[PDB]
Every structure is written in C-alpha cells, then in structure tokens.
Design a binder for this molecule. Sequence first.
Ligand SMILES: [Mg+2]
Ligand SMILES: [Zn+2]
Ligand SMILES: [Zn+2]
Ligand SMILES: [Zn+2]
Lengths: 49, 49, 263, 51, 133, 66, 90, 339, 137, 113, 174
Amino acid sequence: LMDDDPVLFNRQPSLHKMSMMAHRVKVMPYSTFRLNLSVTSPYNADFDG
Amino acid sequence: NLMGKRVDFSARTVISGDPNLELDQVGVPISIAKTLSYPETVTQYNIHR
Amino acid sequence: EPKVNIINAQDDEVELMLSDVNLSLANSLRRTMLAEVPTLAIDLVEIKMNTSVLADEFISHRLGLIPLVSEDVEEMKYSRDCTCEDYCDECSVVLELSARHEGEEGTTDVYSSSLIKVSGPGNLNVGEPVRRDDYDQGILLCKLRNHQELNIRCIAKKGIAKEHAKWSPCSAIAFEYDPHNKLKHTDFWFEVDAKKEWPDSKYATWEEPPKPGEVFDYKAKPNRFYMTVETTGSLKANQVFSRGIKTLQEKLANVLFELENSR
Amino acid sequence: QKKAMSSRAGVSQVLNRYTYSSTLSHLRRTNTPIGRDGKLAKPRQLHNTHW
Amino acid sequence: SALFDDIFTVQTVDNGRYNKVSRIIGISTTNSAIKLTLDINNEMFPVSQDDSLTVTLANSLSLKSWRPPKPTDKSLADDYDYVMFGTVYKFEEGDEDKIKVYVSFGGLLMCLEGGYKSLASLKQDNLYILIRR
Amino acid sequence: MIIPVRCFSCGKVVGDKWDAYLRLLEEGKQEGDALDELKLKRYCCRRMVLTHVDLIEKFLRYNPLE
Amino acid sequence: LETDGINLAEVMAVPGVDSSRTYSNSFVEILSVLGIEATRSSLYKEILNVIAFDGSYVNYRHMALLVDVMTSRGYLMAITRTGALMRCSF
Amino acid sequence: KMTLRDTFIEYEQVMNMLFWVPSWDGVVPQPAILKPKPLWTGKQLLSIAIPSGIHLQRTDGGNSLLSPKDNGMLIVDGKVMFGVVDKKTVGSGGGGLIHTVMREKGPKICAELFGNIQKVVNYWLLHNGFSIGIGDAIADASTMKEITHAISSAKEQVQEIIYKAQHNELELKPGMTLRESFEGEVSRTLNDARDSAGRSAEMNLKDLNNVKQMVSAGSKGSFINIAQMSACVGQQMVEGKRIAFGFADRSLPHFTKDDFSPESKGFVENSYLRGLTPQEFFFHAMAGREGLIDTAVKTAETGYIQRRLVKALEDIMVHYDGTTRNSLGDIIQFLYGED
Amino acid sequence: VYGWSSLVTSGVIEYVDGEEEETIMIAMTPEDLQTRSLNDTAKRIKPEMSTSSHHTFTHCEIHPSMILGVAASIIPFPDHNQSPRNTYQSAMGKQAMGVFLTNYNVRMDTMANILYYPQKPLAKTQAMEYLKFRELP
Amino acid sequence: MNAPDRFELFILPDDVPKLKITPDSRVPNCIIIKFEREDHTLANLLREELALYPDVTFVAYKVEHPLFANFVMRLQTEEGTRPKQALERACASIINKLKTLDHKFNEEWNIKN
Amino acid sequence: VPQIGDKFASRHGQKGTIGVTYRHEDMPFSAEGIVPDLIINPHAIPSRMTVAHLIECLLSKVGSIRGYEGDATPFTDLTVDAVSNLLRDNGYQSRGFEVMYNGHTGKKLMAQVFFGPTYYQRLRHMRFGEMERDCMIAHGAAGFLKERLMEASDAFRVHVCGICGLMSVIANLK
Ligand SMILES: [Mg+2]
Ligand SMILES: [Zn+2]
Ligand SMILES: [Zn+2]
Ligand SMILES: [Zn+2]
C-alpha cells in the first residue's frame, strides 16, 4: 500500500452515508491511523481509544 | 459450513489527530501498509518502478 | 559585541547573564546544551547471572541512567565511526559489577561505587562513575538478600540526548528575560490587579521598573537573558557551555562546507 | 450439571487482579438477576433507600 | 499626489473593549459636516481628547510584493507620524451632499462624512492615510 | 519499587538521596525541611522523592528460590 | 379549540365550526373520513412537527418520499416486517 | 482569538505564517500599518488563506456598516473587511464561508481551504499560547453577593408559594390538579433563579476569562456550563418531576416529614467550585444515573427505527425519465421531490 | 481489648438497616446537633433547616464520605464533579496499572501488569488509609 | 516495529544529501532549501540571523511534520546579491559571534576562578 | 514502554491516548526550567465540568511545594481560597498560572499556562455488515458491492456446457 492510494475508511456504527469515505494514504511510522480533525465530526469519533 | 482461504484486505486500529494532514488524507502505519497489498498489472509505463 | 556576566559559579551549576545577543541565539544555545552535547553512557548490558528480585531489563535500565565521567569524551569515536567488529577499546568502555550478600541476616545495598572500570581507551579520563565525594556511595542500584548474587558486565558508549535522554548532561536549564514585561511579550491574567497578583521575578532587582508616565518603546528587542545551567556531574558547567558553543559552531561549519561543496 | 437449564449463571466469577483496588471492588459486588418481570428503568434507578 | 487633506479636532476617544485599539471621532476645524470616525493603535500613536491631527488621504506614496524600505529611498510617509494602508469597501452617495466613505485598514475601520467637493477624488480602491501630530 | 535514578521531568540525579532522606526523617525533621536540606528546589524532584514507595523491602521478605 | 379524543365527522358537522379547516392528529381516521391525499398531507404535517420540535431541519424531499411510499397503495402501510436452492438451504 | 481587532503580528512571524500556506502565491501583502513600524493584523493573514473572488455578508444584531462591536462579517474578494471569525462563519451552518466556497469554487478548493486555515491558525496559536485554569471559574465578591441575594429571594418566593398552597390560596391552572400546579410553579421559580444567577455570572466574566473565550468562539462549552461551574448547579430533575419521596414522605432520613423546601427535594444552591453537600451530591448522582439510562435506551430505540426505515426504502431509485420507482417498477413519485 | 464491638455494646454506636431508617432522624454532622445563632463566599451553603422550630435528632452520621464505595473513594474531591464523570472514573479504575500484590514474582497468572515506580497520590483522601492505596499505589 | 531507530534522527544516510537546493520561479531570485537531520536549533538561528540583513527581502522556515527530522527554508534576496552568498555570510557571522562569546565566557570564568 | 496510541487517565474520567511525543528541549518551559510530563487540551475541561481536576492539581502543587500530601476528602471545610493563599505564601501565583516560554523559539507565550502535578494512571488495554452495505448503496457504487459480494465471499469460476448443463467441461486457456 502506497501514497495517494484511495482506501475506504469507516467507523462503526455507520448511521449515515458519510460515515464511510474514501481517503488518500500517507504512510507514516508508529501504530495509529491519523486523520484530520475536521473529519472527526462527520465520523462522530474522538481519540479516547 | 466452510473454511479455508487467505484474505487480508482489511484492517482495524486506533486513531489519533494530525493537524498536518489534508482533509482527504489518512495516516497509515508502515506495518499496516506492508500487511495490505494492491495487485497492479505490469504495463510498459510502470514496469521500471 | 556579545558580553557575558557570570553571577554565580560552582562545580555543578552556573548562573549567568547573557547580553548583546539575539533571542534565537540564546534559545538555540540552550537547546544545544540540552540535546546535542555528546556524553558517555552505558548502552550495552550483558547479565552473566542475576538472582535479585529485580527484572533483568529493570536493572539494565537503571544502569543506563547512571552518569559517567565524560571529560575526555571528545577524543573517543562513535560506534559507527569505528571499523572494528562489534566494539573495541577505542570506541567503548568496559565496566563490571559483582555483588553478593553473605549470611542469613541483613541486606546488602549495591551502589554505583561498586562499578569498576575494567577497560577503556587509555589514557583518556572517561568511564569512571561520577562521585560527589570520595566517601559517597552514590546511586543506589539494587538490594540483595541471602544467597542472592549479581554479576553484570556493561559497555559504555558515546551518544547525545537526542537518541536517548540518558546521554543528557544537563538536568534543568533555567532561562528567562525581561523581568518587568517592558516589551509586553505576555499578557497577565488577573482578577483585580495584575501587579499585586503576580510574584516578582528573582531578577526583578537587576532591571529598573518602568515609570508610570513612560510610553511604550515599540523599537525595543530582548537583549538580556538570565540563565542557570545545572549538570549531572558528568561534565562541569563551564565544560558544558564551551562544548555547546563548539557543537553549534561545528554544525554551522558543516552547513557552510556543504554549501561550498554544492557548487 | 443435569439441571443446567434454569440454573443461575454468573454467580461465581474469576477474581480480578488488575490492581488492589480492583480486587477489593470485585470482592464487594452484588448482582441483580433480572427475570423479564421488571420495568426496565425501575430496577436500574438509584433509589433514595440506597443512601 | 494627495487626494484629501484636512485638520481635525478630536471630540471623544473611546478605548472600548480593546487595550491596543482606540476608536476616535474628529471634526474638521476648517469646515463642519466633515466627520472622521477612525480606529487607531494606542501603542503606535497614542492620542488624547481635544487634540489637533493633520490628516491626509492619498492613493500612492511615490513623490507588487512588499519589501522593507531601504533608508536611502524616501516617500510621502517621511512627512507624517502615523501611516496606514487600507481598502475602500463602501462609497455611499446618500441624499444631497451627504457622502460616506467606508475604508478598512486590515480590520481597523474608518468612516468619513463629507460633501461631494471634498470626497470626489476618493473614489478609489486602496487608500493610504497619513496622520501628523 | 525502588528509588528512581533520575527525576522524571527535569532529570536531576535523585537516586543517591534516599538514604539521606530517611535518616533526616529519623531525627523528626519535617518532610519539607528534609527536602530543603537535600537541595531539592524544583517541585518535580520534590514529588519524585516524597511520593516514592519502597516496595522492594516487601520483595526481600520472601525466601529466595536459590 | 383543542379537544381530547377524536371524532372528526361529528365535530365538522357542528354549526359554527369551520368544517373546511378542521384537523386531527390521528391520520387513520383522517383516511377513514377525508381521503388518501389528506392522509398524506396530515402524516407529513405530523412527521414535520416531530422532526422540528427540537429545531432540527430536514429537507422536504426525504419526508415527501417517505410519505409517498407509505401512502402509495391507497392504504396506510406500516414500516414493519420460491427458489429451490433457498428452499433446500432452509 | 487571531481575528480580534487588537491582534498585530510582527514581520518575521508574518513571513513564517505566509510560508506555511501551501496555496500561497508568494506575494506578501502590504501591512495595515506602515509607520513607525510595519504591523499586520490577524484578519489579513486569515484572508491570505481565503481564495479570491469570494464575497460574504452577515449582519449580527442589526449591526451597522461601521461595526462598533466588531460583529457581523464582510468578506470582499477573499479579504475580510470586518467581523470576528467564529463558528458563525467557519462552522457547519448553512451560508457560511465553507458553504460559499463549496458552491463557488468546487470540492478541491473547499478541501484545500480547511488545510490552509488549520495550518495558519495552528502556527499562530502555537506561538501565542492558550490555557484554562481554576481561576477562570471564580467570580468576584460583588457578583457572588448578587447571586446569593437572587437565590435567597427565590427561596423566599418558594416559601411564599408553599404558604399559599397550604392554605388553599393557590390559583389552579385549568385541566390540572393543585399538587402538580404547585410543583410546576416551584420548578419554574427555581429554573428562573438558576437562569438569573448564571446570567449574572456571565456578565461578570472579563474578556480575558478563558471559559468566556471558549464560549464566544463556540468551540466548547455553553452558558449553562458557566452557570453550573460558577453560580448554581440548579434543581435536580427526575422523570419530569423533582426528587420523589423514596422514604416515608421524605426524600432522605435527614429531612423531616412533608418538607417541600427546595433543598429537601433536590435543589443545589452551591456551584461546582464551592462543592456539593451530601444530599445535593446524592441527588445529582440520581439525576446522572437517570440520564445515563435514558440515553442508553434512546440510542437503541433510534438504531432500531433507523434500521427498519432503511429496510423499508432500500430499493427506491430515480430513473432516467425523472420518475421515482421501486424495484417492482411501481411509481412512487412522478417527479423526484416534485421538482 | 477495647474495640469496635466494645463501642457497639456500650450503647454509643448502633446498626440500622434500610427498613429501620424510615423511623429515625439523622444529622449529617455533629455540628448540626447544636443550632448556631459567617457571611463568607468561599465556603458552601448549608441547608437552612427552618421548617421546624426545633429538631429532635436520634442519630448522627459518622462521616458522609462513607456513603461511597471502594472505587469512588479514590476520586479526589468527588463533590466538585459531575456525576457521570465520577461513574466513568469508577468504571475506568479497574483498568489501571499497579502492583496488585507483593508476591507477584512467585505467582503464575494468565496476565499480569506491574508498574516499575508506583507513587502515592499527592492529593489523597482519608479512606485511602484503609484501602492500602498509599502502600500499593 | 513501526518506530524508526533513534540514531537516524541525527545520523544522515549517505545516499540522501544533507542539503538540497531548488529554485522558485514564482518570484525572482528565490530559492528553497531542504535540510535533513536538522530541527529548530539551527533553523531559527539561521532564519532570524538572515532576517536582519538589509539585502534579504524574505526569509522563512517550516517543519512540515514533527515525526520527520527535516525542515525547509524559503529565502529571497534583492537583485544585487544572491541568496547563497547571503547564506554563507550569515553562517560566518554566527560563527564569529559564537567565537567571541566563548572567548568572553572563558575570560569571565577564569576571573571567577 | 509508553508510545503513540497508549492510553492514560486521570482520577476523574479524563482518558486520552498519546498523540505525539516531544523531547525535553521542544517542550514549553517555565522560568525555572521545569518542563511538563503531559500537555492536555483545555477544551476537555469546560464540557465535562471537571473542576475537581483543577482543584487536585492546585492542591498537589501546594503539597509538593510544602512537603506533604493534601487531604482531598469530600464534604470537608477546605475551600479553594485557602489553597490559593497557601500557594501564594510560597512565592507562586495564587491560581496556579505560570509564565511559560515557547520551546522552539524561546519567546514568552502570550497566555499563561495552568501548570502542576497531577495523579495519572496507565490503562491496561494496549467487519463488512449490513449498515456498510446500505452506506455503499447510498453512495451508488455498484462495482464495490459486486467486489464485496465476490471477493469477500466464496466466488469461483465454473465452466458449464450450454446444452447438457453438467460438470463435463475441459478448458485449455493457452
Ligand atoms: Mg470514543
Ligand atoms: Zn572500535
Ligand atoms: Zn526534577
Ligand atoms: Zn454438455
């Protein structure tokens, strides 16, 4: 998997159609997915685990 | 009743924020990137890389 | 143009005033002391036999944080700079520790003074653990009961605090400027009165307070920085300051050489 | 074991050992065996008598 | 050169809710019906009530990337103490000879009230305001 | 478990002052005075020394396995 | 007037009452009295009231589609719950 | 914080902030102040990140074009003329800057706007600083006295209502009994008291108060949070009523029988800063447990309803003739949305 | 030996269950036993206690902080928090890391987590004395 | 596993150059310099040293993401000079300042000895 | 060893994971050179109204300065003003605010920072269903539905005679 590769990304539950979206991959070290802050609100997610 | 196959086209893990990412970008660990794979067909343009 | 005034000077810490320099230069110098001053620290631990109640990685990590005398650490070379296989006498210091408790009573305390410098790049003055005095036992390493023994061989190498904090030669660097907030670099939170609700800086007497009728000086820039440097005993404070200046100079010289060679 | 049907489950649990306070909390726990005859919210409310 | 020039007396100085910005109101001494409501910086140009200010409005400082001006070069700003640059965002041609000019210097607002003869040349896009004393 | 070698926040060597701290507490000196006599100015070192629990003294009670 | 209980025809037949504007919140008897189109209008009104009580906004087209689905067959349809291979799979 | 009227940036910080914009064109704007020292306002460096050709007008509270309170918003050619930028502009509401850029430029420019604004604002906040402390929840002596006076007056009014009810001198609301009318009047009085105390606490707050900054920005918190932290927690609320008499005609054994005083049935005069008395603590715990249970059942009910709704309208699709038909081919709407 | 049972049998402390609490009058604190005849904004506001001219108390609480459980006794200043936060902290407390026992070396459990350098909290409560928290933090 | 080695934060691989230079054609006489295995310690010093020069019209630096030990700097001078020569001038000036500072500190310490 | 993604929590339900780790020189520092072990977001405070977190921080700072452990027992006579007076008697700001310097540049921060010790504990914990199908149906990407229904299932190619319809086909692709 490489940079700029479109990948589908989802949070459960997927109540609405933009709870699952296509993003562009950026490969970076360490063991957490990284997201922009502004897309956390449509995902209805926080970084508490 | 069915068993026997090797599918590794999905992943799930914890997330964190990153202000230095675009709205459509997602950070991916190197281990997760190596675990997943994309099948690309060899052409004349992409043969070298 | 730059001027240095030393306020207090002793073996482990130095408090001074730095004037006629830019703020970024002082901040970079402080960062250079904090991170990029090479010292000597234990980096490889070979445990021959351990019977204590502490884990092997526990005692190894505790051994890693022991300060070592790094006065002549400049003459040594990095591990990747040495063509010898693994490690040799010119790029590492070999120390050994052997402790045991005898008898059915009492508890034996293993300190850092038990560490003995088996070998090193002679006749350089490095490798010895730092002792406050001649009679001081030093850092408490472990505790042993009856029939409990510890036999460890350690290798000490040269590094910088960027790689791991155990090579950091400084503990805390106090750094401040503009005690009276003449430049208005900060806005003071208050409930009734800002002046009464905020303690005076310890250097408030070194600069005259502003007069009530004074107007703001928009062309003024920070010029005097009061800083106190404390060391862990691996290097004296004057040595730390000089080596930080030398490290920054070497970095700038390397950049200059790269620019010249780029043509 | 012959009467596993209608046998109350969860009475015995593996003792928690994550930390001392967790063990102490586990040793002082009470469980209410709902039997579909409750009114949902009513058994889950914090009553005044619990003072 | 200079599109407008006048001398104003400050009626009131309003510090308002800000510590660095004051909104002042001024009346031209040479002629009434010309009012100036301008937001200025306290630290850069402190002002007081009942002060005389020489106000000039121009379109260029000559006698697109910005640069720090060299000491060798000179401009109109050498003759004044407080120079600001901004964008004209409203030109209200109201009833009869009531004309309003609304200019925003980076969020600091200026409203000029006057007749057509004084404000005819001010129909520009960007303006420099120069205040002396 | 045992006294840490260095302060977590700043990095001052505090592992050599545990015995001195206990001995100072033996003479009935207050904890603040004992910390002051050890030249622990910043409160990071003060919380490093003050809040430590010497659990190893329990671990040494059990008979060794060899 | 707001009256507890539902009897639409008798209320509309009462003199002094505007029989052309009487409304009810029970759309079943609205269908039994007024008709299917009035039922669609009343059910849309009810769903809009429920949605907009708290102040939220939903586009009209979604609710229009929902009410049209619910009233497409000429009667109310509640939102509530062959192949040999599937027959043998069961 | 950056788009405030009295925010000025030095030249070097302006260059650093401008370089942080991926879409910057390399032309430094002229500073708002030229003499005696160049100075840029925060509005200029925010307008740097806004693409050109964007216009937006918003009027807040009937503000004039002169904008004495710096409210409203005016953006001309991708430049902010006046108005503090807050949730009313860069939020998710309709008609905002994001919506305008979406409708005007397109998805790519709208996506890049997020990154530009975030980078600029994050650098400025990194080199400016922001925090919150305990002192932000403390009111002065005068406001505390005012809050205490309001609470005491409300308690006296509640006592008067109790006295009127106990002598059959309370007006009966139509279609509802005397006891619930009395309870409703008491609840209304207590709610008005809490609102008044919180309002006084809100008008106390200085502009340097970090909680007030958060509330004004809209990022986190609201007026009720300030009211509960500084002035009064308020009446604890159970199943649409006050605290019921769990014991024999008394909420707790520490109260005498038939006690309708506000403290007896779950009114928390103290704020979170002051601390809660044990009875208030227990009542607050009861209210919190009820809220947790209600949320836990409501989420399940909504999930079931949503799943059933999706199952109902799964096979509805707009065809090429403009009609809206199901899988069977039956027409649901002759035109999608009637338009 | 004079202990808790000696206190109980001497008639100064007695046990009451939930059903007996219906018929007794309880005071929060000993200070509530004696009615006073101040005006400080820092302290909290106690109940007025003006429904009755005089109160005939039959029992007094030993300490209100004893109404909490073991998990809630770890929270410093629980009276200054919202109740859902207290519930969340109580739930998350069991997932913490610490020294569960001093004989962890000799035991063989499926999973065990041991912190290197536990420290007693700087802000403690009285109940922490009886939970051995300052000895096994 | 996913965390890179710590020594790579300062030890530069031989294949990757220490310093990379590209031009910027949007405005005249402007260059972009990529520094590897460096951070704010050198970056801020060089930037604010260059910002005081009369012939320097624009100087800035940034670190795109903290997990990568590299930064970038944009430098544009006037037509009379070139950005490179200004860069060596700044480096030499800082070297001289540090040398003077070290000499003065040594003298003061010897006096206080 | 703690790293990115590991969870920690205070004693008031303020759980959070590590986003990034900064070295000693990159952290903000007070006038005494003290750098924080943790930096937490202020926005977590006003929404949850955890005033006890701030009070515990203030009390811990006072206790560490004076050399004792504070008493945070609920339903006591302790007030915030008393702790503030105790802190102010020790030469610090009464509300716990401190003047902090930026790590990168050394310039003073405009806003003072709440700063002090606090008790933190490390936490232990280190499918394509129907709703995803509905979401992708709403997006209208039928190809992805086909791929999920085949690749994430037991799909396999089978050659069948068009006349007999039995399993009697031999195929040579080359
Ligand atoms: Mg979450
Ligand atoms: Zn070697
Ligand atoms: Zn320390
Ligand atoms: Zn066939």
